[PDB]
Design an enzyme around this catalytic site. Structure first.
Site, PDB file in Angstrom:
ATOM      1  N   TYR A   1      -7.730  11.713  13.822  1.00 43.48           N
ATOM      2  CA  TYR A   1      -6.362  11.666  14.452  1.00 43.48           C
ATOM      3  C   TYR A   1      -6.386  11.813  15.965  1.00 43.48           C
ATOM      4  CZ  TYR A   1      -4.544  11.853   9.594  1.00 43.48           C
ATOM      5  OH  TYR A   1      -4.274  11.687   8.321  1.00 43.48           O
TER       6      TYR A   1
ATOM      7  N   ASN B   1       1.250  13.481   1.809  1.00 43.99           N
ATOM      8  CA  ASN B   1       1.834  12.290   1.093  1.00 43.99           C
ATOM      9  C   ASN B   1       2.710  12.716  -0.087  1.00 43.99           C
ATOM     10  OD1 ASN B   1       0.392  10.422   2.714  1.00 43.99           O
ATOM     11  ND2 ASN B   1      -1.300  10.155   1.225  1.00 43.99           N
TER      12      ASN B   1
ATOM     13  N   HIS C   1       0.113   3.901   7.815  1.00 46.54           N
ATOM     14  CA  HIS C   1       1.522   4.491   7.920  1.00 46.54           C
ATOM     15  C   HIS C   1       2.284   3.954   9.122  1.00 46.54           C
ATOM     16  CE1 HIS C   1       0.632   7.786   4.864  1.00 46.54           C
ATOM     17  NE2 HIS C   1      -0.620   7.468   5.225  1.00 46.54           N
TER      18      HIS C   1
ATOM     19  N   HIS D   1      -1.188  15.301  13.403  1.00 42.56           N
ATOM     20  CA  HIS D   1      -2.648  15.287  13.152  1.00 42.56           C
ATOM     21  C   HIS D   1      -2.914  16.577  12.374  1.00 42.56           C
ATOM     22  CE1 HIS D   1      -6.998  14.767  13.886  1.00 42.56           C
ATOM     23  NE2 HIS D   1      -6.944  16.024  14.184  1.00 42.56           N
TER      24      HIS D   1
HETATM   25  C1  HEM Z   1      -5.238  13.442   2.066  1.00 40.00           C
HETATM   26  C2  HEM Z   1      -5.457  12.244   2.545  1.00 40.00           C
HETATM   27  C3  HEM Z   1      -4.559  11.825   3.647  1.00 40.00           C
HETATM   28  C4  HEM Z   1      -3.180  12.045   3.804  1.00 40.00           C
HETATM   29  C5  HEM Z   1      -2.228  12.913   3.023  1.00 40.00           C
HETATM   30  C6  HEM Z   1      -2.889  11.296   5.003  1.00 40.00           C
HETATM   31  C7  HEM Z   1      -1.570  11.216   5.525  1.00 40.00           C
HETATM   32  C8  HEM Z   1      -1.221  10.464   6.668  1.00 40.00           C
HETATM   33  C9  HEM Z   1       0.151  10.341   7.185  1.00 40.00           C
HETATM   34  C10 HEM Z   1       1.339  10.953   6.499  1.00 40.00           C
HETATM   35  C11 HEM Z   1       0.114   9.580   8.364  1.00 40.00           C
HETATM   36  C12 HEM Z   1       1.217   9.177   9.256  1.00 40.00           C
HETATM   37  C13 HEM Z   1       1.681  10.314  10.241  1.00 40.00           C
HETATM   38  C14 HEM Z   1       2.853   9.748  10.986  1.00 40.00           C
HETATM   39  O1  HEM Z   1       3.908   9.632  10.336  1.00 40.00           O
HETATM   40  O2  HEM Z   1       2.684   9.353  12.119  1.00 40.00           O
HETATM   41  C15 HEM Z   1      -1.270   9.277   8.564  1.00 40.00           C
HETATM   42  C16 HEM Z   1      -1.776   8.552   9.640  1.00 40.00           C
HETATM   43  C17 HEM Z   1      -3.156   8.351   9.959  1.00 40.00           C
HETATM   44  N1  HEM Z   1      -4.222   8.682   9.091  1.00 40.00           N
HETATM   45 FE1  HEM Z   1      -4.116   9.906   7.460  1.00 40.00          FE
HETATM   46  N2  HEM Z   1      -3.978  10.666   5.533  1.00 40.00           N
HETATM   47  C18 HEM Z   1      -5.024  10.924   4.658  1.00 40.00           C
HETATM   48  C19 HEM Z   1      -6.382  10.567   4.918  1.00 40.00           C
HETATM   49  C20 HEM Z   1      -6.884   9.951   6.064  1.00 40.00           C
HETATM   50  C21 HEM Z   1      -8.311   9.756   6.349  1.00 40.00           C
HETATM   51  C22 HEM Z   1      -9.432  10.136   5.406  1.00 40.00           C
HETATM   52  C23 HEM Z   1      -8.356   9.252   7.648  1.00 40.00           C
HETATM   53  C24 HEM Z   1      -9.513   8.908   8.428  1.00 40.00           C
HETATM   54  C25 HEM Z   1     -10.743   9.519   8.336  1.00 40.00           C
HETATM   55  C26 HEM Z   1      -6.970   9.083   8.080  1.00 40.00           C
HETATM   56  C27 HEM Z   1      -6.672   8.542   9.318  1.00 40.00           C
HETATM   57  C28 HEM Z   1      -5.346   8.310   9.802  1.00 40.00           C
HETATM   58  C29 HEM Z   1      -5.038   7.691  11.038  1.00 40.00           C
HETATM   59  C30 HEM Z   1      -6.009   7.044  11.925  1.00 40.00           C
HETATM   60  C31 HEM Z   1      -3.630   7.682  11.154  1.00 40.00           C
HETATM   61  C32 HEM Z   1      -2.719   7.137  12.200  1.00 40.00           C
HETATM   62  C33 HEM Z   1      -2.449   8.405  13.081  1.00 40.00           C
HETATM   63  C34 HEM Z   1      -1.735   8.024  14.363  1.00 40.00           C
HETATM   64  O3  HEM Z   1      -1.850   6.862  14.869  1.00 40.00           O
HETATM   65  O4  HEM Z   1      -1.159   8.913  15.019  1.00 40.00           O
HETATM   66  N3  HEM Z   1      -6.058   9.537   7.150  1.00 40.00           N
HETATM   67  N4  HEM Z   1      -2.064   9.765   7.501  1.00 40.00           N
END
Ligand code: HEM
Ligand code: HEM
Lengths: 726, 726
Positions: free
Chosen positions: A388, A174, A101, A365
């Site tokens: 996060y 999402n 993202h 987060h």
């Molecule tokens: C239901 C499944 C998930 C949804 C709905 C989701 C949604 C999102 C969204 C919307 C963002 C961006 C937030 C922003 O705008 O800054 C994001 C970032 C992120 N996601 Fe998730 N995600 C999912 C699963 C995962 C999984 C399984 C992991 C890791 C185990 C993950 C790790 C991350 C990381 C590392 C970031 C970047 C966060 C940051 O740098 O602050 N995501 N995700």
């Protein structure tokens, strides 16, 4: 003094339609739009007018055009501390982009619930309809970098930070109700498969490449969210016209300690609407910032994005009453089985002042919950809770990222944590540990209670051995893809077949295409045959005989899964291109422009050059853009008023403008001699549904065009668009 | 085993034309292509076949599909160290992108001089025509992020790291021979003006926005490189078909201590070629990785990018002999005044293995020079020397970036520097300072000398007071923009006028458009009037009476500044689309493929679906892409063989494919009944220069098409394309 004398450099601090004024920082465009979080950022907002230019140490600069040198053609001197501070800061401006993202667009707003939800949750921000909670919302794509394009085919993120009186709650969702994978341990594998391939770092912003489809062919749990990405859900018209979902089942906990399972939804009050694939792909070239622009300009116009929060609620005793596992994030809960209960409204009504400081540094987060909410054992959610907090330590430079202004709570926060890189808070507590006597144990723990209490986890029973094992209840992969497919209209199903056909055409290894077609034959034979035909693949007799998966709890469709099956169109905030000529019929243009203004639809006046044209009666018409500069891609419909049509009738750009709008199913209205453009798009004399035509723009001409606009696109035209080279 | 039994998952380790095999890491595609640098990276290459999957501590993993949980539907456990290591690494994968030139594509290769240059320089890499120096080259855009598009309008970087036996030399150049600004102190102002605007972070990869043109209108020193950027130089066809320049005057120092001023050049041995703007902008949408992919696939095909290094040499006594300051980087040295002396050849012949490790982490810096080279007081070069050293400390995580494998010297390096984050070298020296006795003062200083000597700066005389002042000799801004304009062909001039017109039409504040047209009237009134007409602006009488700037040292034009005025075409490595039908005439296809193969020109076989079609003689033709999936934007010319033309005669996408290629000036060849497509593009029976036609595809038909391809585009068609609606 370099500004024009007329003051035309500065945008009006009032709502104005897209293109009417230069865009500006939110606190300069809309100074009187306020909320508690926007007010709390005042301590760090910095102005500029009437202040001297200085170093960051406050030393005024005399000459910011030159380095200090020994002679005016001599070497630069090391003692130039003003040049080295300015270049040092420039050299270190970048921070790591988000791992996923990284491309996203954000705005401020506020939330209010419609009624108190005190019977089902003690969360303070849902306790009182008169309690307003500031929000900051970021919308995003998933795969591409921060410099990638907006209208790619992808899932979109929808992240909301709620600044509540009992803590920050981030709802990190999402635009589809399920994810691709079941267990967080696979998230690096899936995301490495969809991301650019590691030898050459191609392709950006596309899942149409061999490693993505290799992983999908080998992991059928992905097929449900792949169906949604290949549908027109993967190409939204705007962030304003998509749904949002938390995906996981979470818990609500009330003051009596009762847990209720919940899945979170956002309903777009502007309705659901997507582009078509050729238009989305071309728009990535002509305006890669189209969604970021559309969001910022909607808020500058007052067309505030609004969403309604809703909950699907399932009692604890109904955990096992469905054909799928509530904890499996690759399964959706059909609204025909569990309706969405309306909970409150969120309005986004102010843009940031500085994109880096507020959007790029925001941290959302899903482990940031508040008393009244809790988690479940969904194994995707459980791993997200680790990730996060961890990623923020390197993206934002250390463990004090909550002190970055956008991320700060508006409620009190006090504890015994100290130090870390770029520590802002100066703690005066004599103690940095508890229990302590030297500050009488403050700040102190607070027991749980109905309001203003400490957080305590719901005491769920855990029983089982320590295992790395997938639940057998999660081992079903084809029924929800089939439910989705059967819920789509026939034109949405064609667009899905076309999405899979185009994607798999870009997979170089043909065996991967054949393995995907085999997985489609487990979902629906019609879909599999139609994709196979476009790939030159013939299904085997075995594939023709695979038995379809079962219905989901007796459903063979659920219309809430379609973008279009139940009309929800809204025209306010949409935009119409008006193709000018050098002697426009001023009465047509008066009638057109006021009809659009009455319904909150914007217009863009286009011609073959910039400047002005003069109407039949002398009215000077200002031109916003040229036919090539602002292509039909960027608008929702096209109107051609009468006048001297021979000025534009042989202009290839004007003609192709109509051909491209026609191909992408947009409404087109032709007044007077503008009906001569019927030949360009091959319309019959007697007319056709979707093309509005009259001797003038009066009577019912505008009402008919607006009716077409409310239905978004002219789906009946799909069979007719092939006999057009565009 | 998940690989197909036929082995079709793995590309052949032999040279293959674009699309014939999946692309692959360089050491797997071309294992026998070696150089000293490539070999030295073997200590850190890691394979994979036949190895167990492990943690980073070497512990074998049994189940990489699941997290450890308490029961198979239970919570994830903190003690899962395998999940947390895997997700910690993924959470910290990103590092800051480069502050400028973030988007770039790189390859390995080698250089050698044609003859010894010891009479002008003691640099060891230029001393012996049989001593080869490995290189690593990165080509880049300037403004966009690492995830932006390749075929934007922008300047391109051309950075070459030479791994010499006397140290790394980095020649960090761009594709135009001047820069936008004169003094490094203004670099953050210029770059902030061209980059996305700070409130909303739009637009990506585009200078067409208010702040860039506000800065240009207020800083006329920018006008020279802005002319280059608005010409077709801003939109190269490939990194193989643009020029390179060091921009600054540097010094060569020979063994007798004599200094010669030098400017560096790279001449593309594939010739100079650019896109046209509508094609470039559409290609940013259809393939935002087009240049990255073309470079990689040219190296996999054996169409290795080759460039000739050239020097413009000016004796020290001629410093002041021109009408412009040699130390001013907004001025070019016309080749009519000082010819480019051929110096050597560079061949890029292997792609990297891992884009992040080798391209993203590569660090080039123009202060990395070697004995035999030196700097001058150019005030832009002078500030660059501070910045590259400084930015690498945060981008690459500390002061040991030279130990990242791609940046390491292949020659010895020893000194007394110690520690720093992620220090790899373990020093055994008992001393970490000099002078020391405890290690007999080793490593020791080395006097300067003819070869293998220590570096000593040329002892330039410095005389002046400590001033922040621009040299008066740099205050001339219009003569070099005019020289460039007058040296372009008439079609290149029309594309410059269009580039300024399109850009300034996207500036919202009209007074900025007016100020830039006022600057254009100081360069050439015909240019200014043509831009003003497209903007609806009328020149004042005062503007019509501005005296043109002087000729540059008597020159009225210099044809080396044009891309096209002197033919230099090379067709090897270009690509033709061949539009198939379901009963292709195999004799036409034989003749076509034979003539293409003889000139090294590749083909892509296209149809209305994927899979195969069978020719009239039973030959099975695999389809590379659909007509929509690989548009004419991606190829240099289009051939339509005969056969069952009725199959495709009425296909909209096939007809549009010819319309687009025609609008974008590409050669088109139609054999036999494919001549029925002459109607889609309005070609008279007698034919048209640029359309090849005949009853069949013989030797004469192919020679005419290949001749057209050697001239790159059919400029004579430009007046005919405005009417086509495409
Ligand atoms: C239901 C499944 C998930 C949804 C709905 C989701 C949604 C999102 C969204 C919307 C963002 C961006 C937030 C922003 O705008 O800054 C994001 C970032 C992120 N996601 Fe998730 N995600 C999912 C699963 C995962 C999984 C399984 C992991 C890791 C185990 C993950 C790790 C991350 C990381 C590392 C970031 C970047 C966060 C940051 O740098 O602050 N995501 N995700
Ligand atoms: C003649 C004018 C210039 C040319 C030809 C030039 C060329 C380039 C090129 C080709 C790159 C990318 C190297 C790569 O591929 O990694 C680059 C990066 C960069 N340039 Fe320059 N540039 C010029 C002026 C400047 C100025 C005046 C400054 C600042 C004083 C500067 C600061 C930077 C920085 C900070 C980077 C990123 C380097 C990194 O992160 O490793 N450039 N430049």
């Amino acid at each position: 003094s370099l500004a024009p004398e007329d003051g035309s450099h500065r945008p009006a601090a009032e709502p104005t339609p897209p293109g009417a004024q230069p865009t500006a920082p939110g606190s300069l465009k809309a100074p009187d739009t306020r909320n508690e979080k926007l007010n709390s950022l005042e301590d760090v907002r910095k102005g500029s007018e009437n202040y001297a230019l200085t170093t960051n140490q406050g030393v005024r600069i005399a000459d910011d055009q030159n380095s200090l040198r020994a002679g005016s053609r001599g070497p630069t001197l090391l003692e130039d501390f003003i040049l080295r501070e300015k270049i040092t800061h420039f050299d270190h401006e970048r921070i790591p982009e988000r791992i996923v993202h990284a491309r996203g667009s954000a705005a401020h707003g506020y939330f209010q619930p419609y009624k108190s939800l005190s019977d089902i949750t003690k969360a303070d921000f849902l306790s009182d309809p008169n309690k307003i909670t500031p929000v900051f919302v970021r919308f995003s794509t998933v795969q591409g970098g921060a410099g990638s394009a907006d209208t790619v085919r992808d899932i979109r993120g929808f992240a909301t930070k709620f600044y509540t009186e009992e803590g920050i709650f981030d709802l990190v969702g999402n635009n589809t109700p399920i994810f691709f994978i079941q267990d967080a341990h696979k998230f690096p594998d899936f995301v490495h498969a969809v991301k650019p391939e590691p030898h050459w770092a191609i392709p950006q912003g596309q899942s149409a490449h061999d490693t993505f489809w290799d992983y999908v062919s080998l992991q059928p749990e992905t097929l449900h969210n792949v169906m949604w990405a290949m549908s027109d859900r993967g190409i939204p018209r705007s962030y304003r016209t998509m749904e949002g979902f938390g995906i996981h089942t979470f818990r609500l906990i009330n003051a009596e300690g009762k847990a209720t399972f919940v899945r979170f939804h956002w309903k777009p009050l502007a309705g659901k609407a997507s582009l078509v694939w050729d238009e989305a792909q071309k728009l990535t070239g002509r305006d890669p910032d189209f969604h970021r622009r559309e969001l910022w300009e909607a808020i500058e116009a007052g067309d505030f994005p609004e969403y309604e929060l809703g909950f699907q609620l399932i009692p604890e005793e109904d955990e096992f009453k469905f054909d799928f596992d509530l904890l499996d994030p690759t399964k959706l809960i059909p609204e025909e089985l569990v309706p969405v209960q309306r909970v409150g409204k969120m309005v986004l009504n102010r843009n940031p002042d500085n994109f880096f400081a507020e959007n790029e540094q925001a941290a959302f987060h899903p482990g940031h919950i508040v008393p009244g909410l809790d988690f479940t054992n969904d194994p995707l959610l459980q791993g997200r809770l680790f990730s996060y907090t961890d990623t923020q330590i390197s993206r934002l430079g250390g463990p004090n990222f909550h002190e970055i202004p956008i991320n700060r709570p508006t409620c009190p926060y006090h504890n015994f944590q100290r130090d870390g890189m770029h520590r802002m808070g100066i703690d005066t507590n004599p103690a940095n540990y508890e229990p302590n006597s030297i500050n009488d144990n403050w700040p102190r723990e607070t027991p749980p209670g109905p309001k203003r209490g400490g957080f305590e986890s719901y005491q769920e029973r855990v029983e089982g051995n320590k295992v790395r094992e997938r639940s057998p209840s999660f081992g079903e992969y084809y029924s929800h893809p089939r439910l989705f497919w059967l819920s789509q209209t026939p034109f949405e199903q064609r667009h899905i077949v076309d999405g899979f056909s185009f994607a798999l055409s870009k997979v170089v290894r043909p065996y991967i295409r054949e393995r995907v077609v085999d997985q489609l034959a487990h979902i629906d034979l019609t879909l599999a045959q139609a994709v196979a035909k476009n790939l030159g693949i013939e299904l085997t007799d075995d594939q023709l005989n695979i038995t379809p998966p079962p219905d989901v709890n007796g459903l063979k469709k659920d219309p809430s899964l379609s973008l279009y099956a139940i009309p929800d169109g809204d025209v306010k905030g949409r935009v119409v291109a008006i193709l000018l000529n050098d002697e426009v019929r001023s009465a047509d243009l008066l009638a057109i422009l006021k009809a659009l203004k009455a319904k909150g639809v914007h217009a863009k006046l286009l011609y073959s050059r910039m400047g002005e044209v003069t109407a039949d009666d002398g009215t000077v018409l200002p031109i916003a853009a040229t036919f090539a500069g602002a292509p039909s891609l960027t608008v929702d419909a096209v109107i051609v008023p009468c006048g001297n049509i021979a000025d534009i009738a042989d202009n290839g750009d004007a003609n192709y403008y109509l051909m491209e709008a026609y191909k992408h199913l947009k409404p087109i209205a032709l007044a007077g001699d503008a009906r001569k453009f019927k030949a360009t798009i091959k319309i019959a004399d007697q007319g056709e549904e979707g093309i509005v035509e009259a001797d003038s723009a009066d009577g019912s001409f505008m009402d008919e065009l607006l009716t077409l606009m409310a239905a978004h696109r002219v789906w009946s035209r799909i069979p007719k668009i092939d006999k057009i080279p565009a």
